[PDB]
Amino acid sequence: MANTPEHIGNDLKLFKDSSCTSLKPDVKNTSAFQSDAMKELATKILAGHYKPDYLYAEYRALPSPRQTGKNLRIGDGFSKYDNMTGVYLEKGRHVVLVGKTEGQEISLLLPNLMRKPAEGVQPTKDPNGWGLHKKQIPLKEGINIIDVETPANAYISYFTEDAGKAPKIPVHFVTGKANGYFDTTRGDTNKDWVRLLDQAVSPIMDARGKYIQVAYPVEFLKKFTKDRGTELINAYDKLIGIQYQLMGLDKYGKIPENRVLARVNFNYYMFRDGDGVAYLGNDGTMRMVTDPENVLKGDACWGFSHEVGHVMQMRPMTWGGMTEVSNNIFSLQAAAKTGNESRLKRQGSYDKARKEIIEGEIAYLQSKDVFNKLVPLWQLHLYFTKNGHPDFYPDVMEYLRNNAGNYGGNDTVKYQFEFVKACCDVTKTDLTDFFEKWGFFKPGKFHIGDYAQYDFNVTPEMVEETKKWIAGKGYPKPETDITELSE
Ligand SMILES: [Cl-]
Ligand SMILES: [Zn+2]
């Protein structure tokens, strides 16, 4: 009764369709079955209480994270594990039945979320590194025999260009175990959450909200979240939603379908890579990020907002020198929306930046402090928020999505002037003086040290053409000196 493609293939003929969730009406017993896997399934069905949940599901294609990023001019650090199954695969040989693919590329992901450094290895210096290791198995239409060496939650990788059009692909983990998952968009409640954790067969529970996906250990979810899984997911959704709102993605119907992943790791306190945000699986860190109130406080809120803001910061607001500047517009907004302190206020940044840049008569580009560069960007928001344009950044980011050019490396300085034009046009305000005082219009050749090093050439013509363009609009000047705004 071995689970060979020939034994399994013969058995497939006994079920009503390729889902194998029901038997042909003349199949009364299991005497004709050739495979252990399909016989065991048919025995469940014949006994009248088969639960296909999770084990069998149909998977919808998502836009690739890189397409999503390109469309919005932002990063592609969205979840590769978005199509969670709620299926856990024990060590052994598994049978996975895939429906019609129409040649679509589709694979199975088995990440090692519980990977730890070897005994006596310093976690930060792990020779295996800090990345999320996984087995990736290409799937074909039909019978897939998959050898699992270490037990794993399963995730489907199914991404295309034109996701609304691609087929739904059925996948049946015949030999799997239903770990389940928590999904607030499905209507799951705290009752569901407690039951999920109590009956979990994996050390990892998968959960998602509107925008967040989390992959955290059951032990920490029970210890700290306990009861409040809905609140936890809502809190991460609030943090991400704050960025989408500031981006104007809600206003203009452009919230991406892709989730952002926050995961456990066993190497380091907190970091972000291409897979998303990672948090150390110890009591200290897990208390901060698996408790729904703690995740919205101070350092936890800032750290998450700061990192996600690297995915969400758009290229036209993130020219050279701006990598650690434009993402913190999100951090400041998230602090304002969660009742936390202003870090610009706490650092005395308005004063530090006015002294460094305005009094120092340097170019904005030459500023040596990423909080000082953040100051005018935040003053604009605080000003326009009070003076009749509450959708300031939402409209500016939409305008730049639609109108900004396409620049890389040393050419990215052109975005500085495009950003200035966008702010004027959106608000119908002549902001020449504000930007002049903050040194946006200083000509020269500037060498700027970000992660990359930039050589910007701001010519007198570039400055004059921007100023001419603004003057030509005939907008009113603000009544007050916006550079004087402080908290
Ligand atoms: Cl920071
Ligand atoms: Zn950063």
Author numbering: 20 to 506
The study reports:
Here, we focus on the mucin-selective metalloprotease, Amuc_0627 (AM0627), which is known to cleave between adjacent residues carrying truncated core 1 O-glycans. We showed that this enzyme is capable of degrading purified mucin 2 (MUC2), the major protein component of mucus in the gut. Of the enzymes characterized to date, AM0627 from A. muciniphila is unique in its strict requirement for adjacent O-glycosylated residues. The M60-like or Pfam 13402 (PF13402) family consists of hundreds of enzymes from organisms known to inhabit mucosal host environments.
To probe the molecular basis for O-glycan specificity, we determined the structure of AM0627 in its unliganded form, with the signal peptide (residues 1–20) removed, at 1.9 Å resolution via X-ray crystallography. AM0627 consists of an immunoglobulin-like fold domain followed by a catalytic domain. The active site harboring catalytic residue E326 contains a beta strand and two alpha helices arranged within the larger gluzincin motif, characterized by histidine residues H325 and H329 and glutamate residue E343 bound to a zinc ion. Sequence alignments of AM0627 with active, structurally characterized PF13402 enzymes highlighted conserved tryptophan, glycine, asparagine/glutamine, and arginine residues that interact with the initiating α-GalNAc of mucin-type O-glycans, as exemplified by a cocrystal structure obtained by Noach et al. of BT4244 with a serinyl Tn antigen. Notably, these S1′ subsite residues are spatially conserved between AM0627, BT4244, ZmpB, ZmpC, and IMPa, providing a rationale for the specificity of these proteases for substrates carrying mucin-type O-glycosylation, a property that may be shared by the entire PF13402 family. The active site beta strand is positioned further from the gluzincin motif residues in AM0627 compared to related enzymes, preventing the formation of hydrogen bonds typically observed between metallopeptidases and their ligands. Comparison of the catalytic helices between PF13402 enzymes revealed that AM0627 and BT4244 have longer helices containing a spatially conserved aspartate residue. This residue, together with a semiconserved Y288, forms a surface that sterically blocks accommodation of a G2′ sugar residue. Notably, a cluster of aromatic residues, formed by a nonconserved W149 present in a long loop as well as residues Y287 and F290 in and around the active site beta strand, was observed adjacent to the active site.
